[PDB]
């Protein structure tokens, strides 16, 4: 497997402060094809996670200039010349250049302290365990099915970074975390346009909250552009 080391997890920060946050991977991140899938992620509080770079080094549409990526092979580095008061959240990078695609432990960018293509992820689900869900995720916007296209599925446990659980392809090429020990599977309605993951036998360990998140185009060298806003499993 790969592990994205990142660092600082803390990187308390001032407004209008210079922030850096870094990558190291196990290993290389390089295809084979060419490009290094790194990106960087960030996730403001209440929200899901949010693409800001995709391919190490590219700043994803809408994403402020002074975001920027600059890595290479092994080490990456996030860089804000300026953060503002939006900037503040965990950011995390993610390689998505090996199977399983990983993520940083993440980062809180915090304030130091003193003086339209749209997924939505069918509602929270509490089940006993043993049981299973399905959750759904709902893609709109875009055509479940242009090349380059697909899902992924993250999970993001309280305290357990995001994990990648699944991914399904437009050409129907569904791939799972064999973390998850063969208990999901990927289905899509093409028609309701909907993928759904179902996860297969629940203990408490699968309570996350989960989001599928497209992988964008070969545009966006597979970067997961756009996120659902999350729905959480809790198993009881």
């Known amino acids: 497997d790969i592990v994205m080391t990142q660092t600082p997890s803390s990187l308390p920060v001032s407004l209008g402060d210079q922030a850096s946050i870094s990558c190291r991977s196990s290993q290389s991140i390089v295809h084979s094809n060419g490009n290094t899938y790194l990106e960087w992620y960030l996730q403001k509080p209440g929200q899901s996670p949010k693409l800001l770079i995709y391919?190490?080094?590219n700043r994803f549409s809408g994403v402020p200039d002074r975001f920027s990526g600059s890595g290479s092979g092994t080490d990456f580095t996030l860089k804000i010349s300026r953060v503002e008061a939006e900037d503040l959240g965990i950011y995390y990078c993610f390689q998505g250049s090996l199977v399983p695609p990983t993520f940083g432990a993440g980062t809180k960018l915090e304030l130091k302290r003193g003086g339209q293509v749209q997924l939505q992820q069918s509602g929270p689900e509490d089940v006993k365990p043993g049981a299973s869900v399905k959750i759904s995720c709902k893609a709109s916007?875009?055509?479940?099915?242009?090349?380059?296209?697909?899902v992924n599925w993250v999970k993001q446990s309280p305290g357990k970074g995001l994990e990648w659980l699944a991914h399904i392809y437009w050409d129907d090429d569904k791939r799972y975390n064999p973390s998850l020990k063969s208990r999901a599977t990927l289905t899509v309605d093409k028609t309701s346009s909907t993928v759904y993951l179902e996860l297969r036998s629940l203990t408490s360990e699968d309570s996350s909250v989960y989001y599928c998140?497209?992988?964008?185009?070969?545009?966006?060298?597979?970067?997961?552009?756009?996120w659902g806003q999350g729905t959480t499993v809790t198993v009881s």
């Open positions: 391919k190490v080094s």
């Open positions: 916007g875009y055509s479940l099915s242009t090349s380059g296209m697909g």
């Open positions: 998140a497209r992988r964008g185009g070969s545009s966006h060298y597979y970067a997961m552009d756009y």
